[model samples]
Target chain A: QSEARRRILETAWRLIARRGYHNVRIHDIASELGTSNATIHYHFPSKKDILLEALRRNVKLAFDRQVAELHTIADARERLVRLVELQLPTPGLLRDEWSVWLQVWTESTLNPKIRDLYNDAYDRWYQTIAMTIRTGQKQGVFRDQDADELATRLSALIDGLGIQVLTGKRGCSVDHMRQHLNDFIEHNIVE
Target chain B: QSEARRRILETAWRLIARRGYHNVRIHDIASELGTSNATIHYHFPSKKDILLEALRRNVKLAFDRQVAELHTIADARERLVRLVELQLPTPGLLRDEWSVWLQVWTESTLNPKIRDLYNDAYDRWYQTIAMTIRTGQKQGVFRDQDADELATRLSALIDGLGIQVLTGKRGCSVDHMRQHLNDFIEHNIVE
Candidate 1:
């Protein structure tokens, strides 16, 4: 039963990634999973529930990977870079997650629970970046710039880049992103 | 006759800036202008036509003003700062224009004409930024980084910052944006 639910979640995510969150319906998810809508309802109850579950799963995996990855890097500046590398959107993963993320973001307007989830994910990522920046400053390897401000800008830059990618805009290629990232960091890191 | 049309356009722009483009209708604009919908239809047959006129007028004026201001300064490094100022999302103008701009961006998917308009606006801005970077490089100020890539990243930053301001995420404050801009620029600029 657990395996089937997992399959349901995976299939739904893939579908949403392909078609967009706005196009996803309970019926569509069930059909893709070779089950009935009632089966989906039995597990998730509402579309919002299904979405929350998907986001929760994504967040857990992302944070776990971040934590593990942070241990491998030694220098605080490098650690900050690694932190950004983790947060930067991966090409394939973005399609499914970007739209899903936007859906969750839009839902935040009316759903208190969803907003809390959004904030939780946001705060966690923000805290990780801020912590990484603090470590860099402490080691005297980074500029005396405020970590919080830097974290916000980095987050905003990622979000901004994501918008470009999703909208099929030019200059959103990975190489392009790295160039800007390097340029951004080169100025902020201590000489 | 042109005066009446300009009034209609101004009213429609204010409506979109205050509300959102998606939420506004021709009837609303007509009512606000103290004219009938039929009168609006006489000049512009559809809601989108009104929006296109508004965007064209507002974006061009804003872009031109920023360009003129950039010319007054001899410091090539400050071009990006001027670009940020152009993008400031100043309370009244920014709040309204950004809401409309975002809607137009999303709506472009459903309307190829809107997409074309947006693309043109995008290209003009890109050229403006790229030209500045080129000038800076020639003046031995900025590095010979890929001008096109920098322009695109800058575009994303501006659009993304505007979105953040509207969504209440980040970059609404002048200090926050200035620091981020300085960090981003100092990395690319040659001393």
Candidate 2:
């Protein structure tokens, strides 16, 4: 039973990651999974439920990776470097994942339920970044500036650059965006 | 002849602005303009030509507005403020223009010809901004950072903010975004 649910969800995610979420339907997922529509409904209940579960899994994976790295990473600077590297364009990240994430973000605007989910994720992300900034400040590793504003600016940079990469107007390795971030960090806070 | 083209173009612009260019067809434009489709084709040759002419007019008007204001705006700081106010989210300007502009920007990427047009408009826009930065540097109002880089970052801020606004993810007044730019201008460079 668990395996069946996993198969249904994985198939649905693959479809959404290929086509956008707007075009994805439960029947499409069942066909891809080689199951009947009744089987998919038995496991997932609704297309929205399937979508929510898939996205919830994806977000958990992102945070899990961040938490795992933060635990092992000693220096605040290295931790930040890792966080930005994951969020920005990097090797091993599927381009289709970028599209799927954008679709999720856009949908959050109209749906208050999704809005709270997005806000919770964003708040956690911001808190982690803010902690790094605060730690750097205490250790005299970063400049004495508004940590809140810096956090917002850094987040904006990642989001903006992501859109730029997805649009194919420009391309950057995770390292290149990191280099720019490093330059800003060095200029703003580093002595 | 130009007058007829301008009327049809303006009607198309309104239709495109309301429903987006992708949603409105050339036939829709003709129907909205109360003219035969042949009349529009007679004036502009193609739908692409009509859209191009509309954008070209906007770019020229933007530059012309700058030129006319330059005579009265002697202070470099004030000029920079003026320029930003026009483009950023504010009243007394075409607020929806940025949204439509971004819509076209994304659409252009899918078509090679429109992509080339995007590059052309981008260069011209950058040239104007670069010139403004140079002027500010000469006048000793802005810090002597890399003028080109400053202009690029400033432009990116506006574009980034536009995306943020259209996506309904954040709230930033023109003043707030301008302050971000001003902070960069003040601190990120050597006076």
Candidate 3:
């Protein structure tokens, strides 16, 4: 059932993120969920299947939150700034999402299966930013540059800053990342 | 003494880049070098000592190349562009260095010892970029913005693009990365 599927994915992803891609096993997921291996495998035919879907669920959760959060902000620039804030990977929900994302990226370097999923998540995030830039340009609030190009640059910036902060690099905190991102929006994206 | 040090580090780092950190052992380095484990240990007290120093040597080599390559380029803008190209992590030397750097970043998240070493490398690179931007501003070739801030933005942008290209993402190649970075310099840095 869909109910069981959701519970399995949520539990599987948490263990995978906390442990590692290679370290987590089907039994581990079943153990964490306090269920049987049959229950986990009934929905996902293989261990890899659960991992992929687990990661997929994580990505969906992030975007669902993004769209849900962005609905209230009326201004394009404000919405863009808020989008930057939402992806900070600082603490709580966003931080948990980043752990999964970074793990996926590391695994993608080694596994083609994970690579496709990471790309799917990346493109979804990319399109969201690109569309926002387009909206800003259409509204005459943002610079009239190529929306795709703008998105590419901003996305890259966010990725760079996020990695440094996420890794707990000294002197690079959430506030540091927040400032750099907001500055990029204020200077490059907005007129 | 330094001769043995350099030779051991080169072999160790090469293997480390090709293999994951946990996979490579001091004996592996010795086997690859056609030497004994004693030789590797003579220079490095432990396996981690070798890895930390191996990663250190890798970071040093990149900057040494960066300084050597930039020495002849007269124009600040040209120098900045060349620097971006140098760090592209494309096929060849930069790519090899990126393998080591990415692994270090990955390990740093879980290991405090690796974290300190990554911070050292990051700071050196950060200061180099920040210093170059200052020189560019001093020469009146770049915008008179905060040179440190400019470097921060540029560095993050490069890191972002480099990861995508390095990972072999569809529609994102080394050339694609080059264009994005060059466009950033042209539009944001150059005038």
Candidate 4:
């Protein structure tokens, strides 16, 4: 069933997050799911294939979910700011997203396919930010800078600050991240 | 001799890089060092202790070495730009440094001590960047923004762009990273 497919995918994602990517195995995933290897095989067919598809789904589902939430907002500037706000690991989902991202990034060093997945995901993210900036620029409410360049800078800020907050760096609290990002938007992007 | 201690540490470092943090162990380090477990313990006493010290030294040596390189340049703006240039993974040392950093970051999410080490190292980094910006501002060469805030943005840019270069993202070459950063300096910081 499609439900088993998602269950296995989430189970694999969690295992990879808790343990490293290299440590998670087919049997381990099956054991976590309270199922057997045969069941996982029916869905994923291979370890690399399954994990990769999960990464893809994770990106789509995450971006789509956030997009849906943000679509109701009218202001481009607020939408952009809200995007960064959503990435902050206030409680759980955002934190897990960063965990999986960190895992895939480190694993990407040794594996080419995983690198492709990560790079592609980041590209989509870049585009999303750029598009939002374009919207703000068209609205004449954002700074008169290259929207794409601004997006690059904003995305980099998110990645850097996101990692620090996720790692629980001293004084680098969620509120701290929120302020830094808000300041970035105010000074750099907002007209 | 102290040389053997250095040798063992380098051995452990390489093994961790080649394999991973959790995958590398005392015996693995010992064998890689072409020595015995007792010899490894003679310097470090235990697995955690040895790897932990390696990380500590790794930060100091890397930071100090880069500082030494950048100090000869008299201009603070030049020094700041060169710092980003030096970080780009053009050759071996920078690439290895990023690889080790990625490993440590992912591992940090699970290990608090490692997180402490990572955060401390970043604290040192923030101070360096803030100092550079302060120097530039004093010279009337850089923008009149908050030094600490600019450093935070620049450092985040470095971390975000650095990963893409290391991972070989399309259009994110060392030259590409250099330009994006150069543009950031010119547009955001340079007066």
Candidate 5:
């Protein structure tokens, strides 16, 4: 992507994360960058195109970043723990990342393209988690269970916790989320 | 509720569920019900009021229906299983019910009234589940754990899996969701 286009995508990402998908206007993005709507339209023909591209790019970016970080760890148990910690939402940037995801989930229901994008992202995530579990199983350190099934369980928990945290639901503290993951790992996976 | 008020609420529910909260207009609801904008305004006073009340009423209705059915089952384990089945999204009606919930969750981020209603509904669900777990513990049929925390975990899993199921994400089948819940019950609760 060109510098100009990258900047536009970044602006769209920040705007969507802060204001939500439905509340964002095309003009808002353009205005934020001191550019005309026609300039934005020149890069992306429509608002939907820009928003979708923004999400697609940002999702891939975040996924790749996490993958890079997780690759640095060798032990399967420690790696999985690190994975959960990385996935859980925190106060500032981490929370903003979840806000983006929350908006993506909400918008995906109405947009088929966005839905497919989200589906692909989830598939990649499941594969990532499953691979880690399979590694542990091969090492004879983790429980003998279906790796894919375990992946589903972990992802579901994260997604579930993420929603509650993002929505500010009561009794959904970060510590509670961490403890839940810890207990599951201790019981389901062996050291 | 009066007949006119009921009609208004029902119409608002369908419109918001189908078109989403941000996209639905009062005139659209009025036209759908074969009534004038003035009629809808007279009944609802505003679009926000109608949507909030519609969600409040529907959430309460669904909660009550589930609670009543759950009360019929004496066995705590079976009651928990039945609760999962009831909560899991199915093909048609259950799917639409989740659609409404998905929209409501998105709207609740910006609407305090809707957020409070959503929070209350979640609290009730947690309480209901906590009560069941406490019963199982009393009977020596379940593991000793904080009932509220267990409730949070269960509800989080449901909320998480519900999103995947609703969004048509891969590897999120109804059977898979059932299995996930079953595994949790088997390991956490006694037979």
Candidate 6:
């Protein structure tokens, strides 16, 4: 990607993270960067393209980072914990990631193309965790269970708790979410 | 609610469900109803007001219906199963509920008032499910567990699966969701 395109994508992601997907127009992003809408259109063709590209970039960046960090950790249990911690809506990139996800999720309802994009990313995410679970089961470190089913439940819990944390609900603090994940691991996964 | 207010609320809910909260404007609702923006304002002073009321009404309606039907089922396990089934985004009311929730969840990130309202409804919903778990535990039909924790887990699973179902994700059909719920129940709630 060109440096100019990268800058445009970064700004678009920030604005979409803050103002949501529908409310953030091309000019809003261009205005933030002190550029023109024509420049953005020149790079991306349309607002939808820009937003979609931004989303794809966001998911890939986060997923790669998560995968890299998890691979460094040798223990499956620790990797799973790290996964939840990384995904939790904390103060930094995770929070922004959740925000972008909320925007993508809301848009996916009305846009079939966005919907497919979201589902595809969701599957990749699910598969990543499922692979971890499969490894755990193979190593005799985790309970014997259907890896895909367990992965779905785990991801669902993360999604559920992540939303509550992001929405600023009481009793849904990061610590609480971490504890929830820990408890789930204790009850379901074996050492 | 007055007849005009009801019409306004219904129209706004439908539009918001279809296009999302930010994309739906008062004028859009008014036009849908064959009325003027001035008339919409006569009933709802602001767009936020209309969206909030519509959300409140939608949540209350679904909560009441869910509670009523759950009360009719005598067995705790069956009630829990019924809860997931009802909450699943099938063809009708649950689908609408999830759509409203998606919009509200996205909006609550930026709007504190909406955030508080969402938290309140969230608390009520959590408490409803928590109470059921508590009942089951007391009767020894369920494991000894923290009701609130279990409730949070249950709701999170619902929220997670509900999103996948609504977003047209593969392998998240209503039957699939029901099976997931039953699996969770069997593993955690029973010996």
Which candidate ranks first by lDDT, i.e. highest? 6
Residue ranges of candidate 5 with Cα displaced over 4 Å: none
- On TM-score, the leading prediction is 6
Query: What lDDT tens digits, residue by residue, belong to model 2 across residues A95-167?
Result: 5455555655545534566656666777678788888988888888887778877776777666655655555
Measured with C-alpha atoms, the lDDT of residue B165 in candidate 3 is 80
Q: What is the DockQ of candidate 3?
A: 0.49
Residue B1's C-alpha lDDT in candidate 5? Answer: 43
Could you tell me the interface RMSD of model 6? 1.1
Docking class of 1: acceptable
Residue B2, candidate 6: Cα error in Å is 2.2
What is candidate 4's DockQ?
A: 0.60
Tell me how candidate 5 scores on lDDT: 0.81
Top candidate when judged by DockQ against the true structure? 6
Residue by residue across B1-191, what tens digits does model 2's lDDT show? 56777788677766655565645677897777688878878878976777777776666666677677666777777777677666665543355466456555544534567656665666666676777778878987667777765665666566665545544544455556668756655565326
- Give the poorly placed runs of model 6, Cα more than 4 Å off: B71-74
Going through the candidates in order, state the TM-score of chain A alone for each one.
Answer: 0.90, 0.89, 0.90, 0.90, 0.92, 0.93
Q: Sort by lDDT, best first.
A: 6, 4, 5, 3, 1, 2
Q: Number of backbone collisions per candidate, in order?
A: 2, 1, 0, 0, 0, 0
Task: For residues B87-166, write the lDDT of model 3, one tens digit per residue.
Answer: 88777677778777676665666668888878877878788788778888888778888887788788888888887886
Model 3 alpha-carbon drift over 4 Å, by segment: A1-12, A19-50, B1-12, B22-50, B72-74
B68-110: candidate 4 lDDT, tens digit per residue: 8886888998898888877787676667777778888887877
Reference contact recovery of candidate 5: 0.51
TM-score of each: 0.70, 0.73, 0.85, 0.88, 0.94, 0.94
Which sequence of candidate numbers ranks them by DockQ, best first? Answer: 6, 5, 4, 3, 1, 2
In candidate 6, what are the lDDT values of residues A62-177, reduced to their tens digit?
88888788767888888888887788777877788889888788789888888888888888878879988988888999999888888888988888888888888776798899
* Prediction 1 TM-score vs. true: 0.70
Give the interface RMSD values of the models in order. 3.6, 3.9, 2.0, 1.8, 1.6, 1.1
State the lDDT at A110 in candidate 6.
86
**All models: lDDT?**
0.71, 0.66, 0.80, 0.81, 0.81, 0.84
